[PDB]
């Protein structure tokens, strides 16, 4: 009724069932074919993976458990007397498929603030970390030293049956949560606040709330951006990076902790996890050029100007959705409701009318729209958040939701060890003459 | 002697002959989609260009196109030493080329220059606290070491695309080079009471100056280091660890982070877990028959195994059609430095008797033993018992192929890995659409 693990146990043998049902009706079904240029090109179109947790509508844009943004913003439960939806809540649509109740996401939240200490030896690392040290790897490494903890790493040791696999690996990953915004905030707190204490977790809280207490923000609409940021952010399908990257490691039968400390060096790749330090680097070099109101006029000459000389607009454009991010959508309400009068996000809203159409006209750019990364780092930055580096950090925090609802059904489900073939350039000239 | 001239010099002709094989077979199809395959971790799908080592479905690995027996005929041996260095077989998987007598020294020489430990690692390596398994300690201390990374800070600054192969090869050969500190300290510290690893000697080959941190000081030790890494160097890019790796890489991630993120996935057991399994199957079996037992007794003991349904670790592959080579080559070893060993002759007694059994049983298609059967016999017989601590020596060899190949992955400009994911919701949609 409210442990979600009695609930997942109901739910696992069904979905098994429906599996083998398909699988028995079209196992060798073909729905794709491999070419050359995928081999070269890492991939790029290949239908590679099961990942049940999020689904990309390229009408729509990103669904969670078939939900929109919008249907999961009006659904999922609110802290008493807010309005975004939290991430707890997110977190039972994906590992159930289903909308939870207030009580359910109460429950969650009790769970995971239970969950949430940390070992000495994982306090002692993150403080002794230099400030050299990015703290994305701060984040692996403690997570990694983390595994001291797993007790599907200890359990597998000892000998476990294959159908209670999923059993520990929901146990390690409801601790690998709870932890999550304890490590996140150390390392914060260690970096830009002199090494202050994050203080205590608060059992009666829910989780952004008991983040943004240990990061040293008290700001009710500030903890209200990062309930909505935590929700937005959880999941984007399987082939991203990180995904694929926990994933991968997963199918090995590594521990959660393993398995996202390794998502988490993925993450940290530039071609991953920097596009919200991007735009707002962009942004702000824009304002302090042009002032903090230029006219539209004035602001569209100097984006053909950008685009003439050969850059482009960081945040705008995209392969396969055909519409505006619902997660830019989601964050321009946001500033429309609690900072309209802020200049850099009044900057972001006029960009939002005039770019789309230079960007159709220019006729490079596929999908001219903007994506989440448009719209984050003014938010982020307006509440006080100014530390980009950092903004990768709050995105694994938000990931981890995704990708270990996704580890647990892996689980579940007995999906076997990820083993594509490799193939040489000498081998493939050999195979495409035979 | 310079491997990174050698390496400039090559790069272009294989950029040129890989663009005329896409021009013509780009869109060449080498394989099909289908549900199972999805569903099955990508069995057989051809789904990735790996340069560095190709497996022969008759021979067993090849490096380069040079098989195993070859390489310890033709690779350089450390003075008065019979078996292949490590150094050679790294040159060998980066430039395809046999590397002269002279290159291996100088190799040599620039692996003990690199070798230095930044203090804040040194410091972290000695504060883990003994239960964390020396995998996870590797996989954070190597994290940390992104600290060090030149490619890390350069692309920040901005780098060339057609030159990130130079401070990734740089990043490379300081990450080999610190890698036997690393794991020689995380060995003592949990095995030898903390006792000091002692110093580089800029006059010694990289095996034996991990042999003498380790605090080992056989000779014939020394010379299994040797043939053991150059060894378990490579296998292609699809199991676990390489495929990570390149994942990882694929990201921009730099060396470090994309090897620390290969040994989260090497630490799965599914994957880094083969040679302790014998092992204490071996123990066990020694155990209940003794040091004594005739070929008769043994052969029933076989019998009685399959008959009820159980397997021999070690024996068996899917596509090798005979003996492992690098399986051959640890039992050529072992009958020169320790035919007398007693685990040594049941391995020994083990090959003589387990195939046929296979055969006459006429079930498993390649009855044959792997690398796995053979290695932590001969460990065992020098000392190293620890058998927690033989993944890492496993990670510590496989960083020499998975890095030749990162450097030629970005040479080559390969992009993103990013194949597409789907739910079971969106297959089922998708074959009923066709
Ligand atoms: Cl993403
Ligand atoms: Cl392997």
């Not at 202050?196 to 700001?219: C, E, Q, R, V």
Request: contains cysteine.
């Amino acid at each position: 009724s409210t442990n979600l693990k009695d609930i997942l146990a109901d739910l696992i043998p069904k979905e098994q069932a429906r599996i083998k049902t398909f699988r028995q009706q079209h196992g060798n079904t073909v729905v794709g074919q491999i070419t050359v240029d995928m081999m070269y090109g890492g991939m790029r179109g290949m239908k590679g993976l099961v990942y049940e947790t999020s689904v990309l509508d390229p009408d729509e844009g990103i669904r969670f458990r078939g939900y929109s943004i919008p249907e999961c913003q009006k659904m999922l439960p609110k802290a008493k007397g807010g309005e975004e939806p939290l991430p707890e809540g997110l977190f039972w649509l994906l590992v159930t498929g289903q909308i939870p109740t207030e009580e359910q996401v109460s429950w969650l939240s009790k769970e995971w603030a239970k969950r949430a200490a940390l070992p000495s030896h994982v306090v002692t690392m993150l403080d002794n970390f230099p400030t050299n040290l990015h703290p994305m790897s701060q984040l692996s490494a403690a997570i990694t030293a983390l595994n001291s903890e797993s007790n599907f790493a200890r359990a597998y040791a000892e000998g476990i049956h294959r159908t209670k696999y999923w059993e520990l690996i929901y146990e390690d990953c409801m601790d690998l949560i709870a932890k999550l915004p304890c490590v996140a905030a150390k390392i914060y707190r260690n970096l830009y606040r002199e090494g202050s204490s994050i203080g205590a977790i608060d059992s009666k809280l829910d989780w952004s709330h008991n983040f943004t207490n240990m990061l040293g923000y008290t700001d009710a609409q500030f903890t209200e951006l990062m309930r909505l940021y935590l929700t937005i952010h959880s999941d984007h399908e399987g082939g991203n990076v990180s995904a694929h990257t926990s994933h991968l490691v997963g199918s090995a039968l590594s521990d959660p902790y393993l398995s996202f400390a390794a998502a988490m060096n993925g993450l940290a790749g530039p071609l991953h996890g920097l596009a919200n330090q991007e735009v707002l680097v962009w942004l702000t070099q824009l304002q302090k050029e042009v002032g903090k109101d230029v006219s539209d006029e004035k602001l569209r000459d100097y984006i053909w100007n950008t685009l003439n000389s050969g850059r482009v607009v960081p945040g705008y454009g995209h392969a396969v959705l055909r519409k505006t991010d619902p997660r830019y959508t989601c964050q321009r309400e946001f500033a429309l409701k609690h900072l309209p009068h802020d200049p850099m996000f009044k900057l972001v809203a006029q960009l939002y009318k005039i770019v789309p159409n230079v960007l159709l006209e220019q006729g490079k750019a596929k999908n001219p729209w903007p994506n989440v990364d448009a719209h984050s780092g003014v938010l982020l930055q307006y509440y006080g958040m100014t530390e980009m580096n950092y903004y990768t950090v709050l995105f694994g925090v938000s990931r981890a939701l995704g990708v270990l609802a996704q580890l647990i059904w892996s689980r579940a489900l007995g999906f076997p060890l990820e083993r594509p073939k490799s193939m040489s350039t000498d081998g493939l000239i050999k195979l495409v003459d035979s």
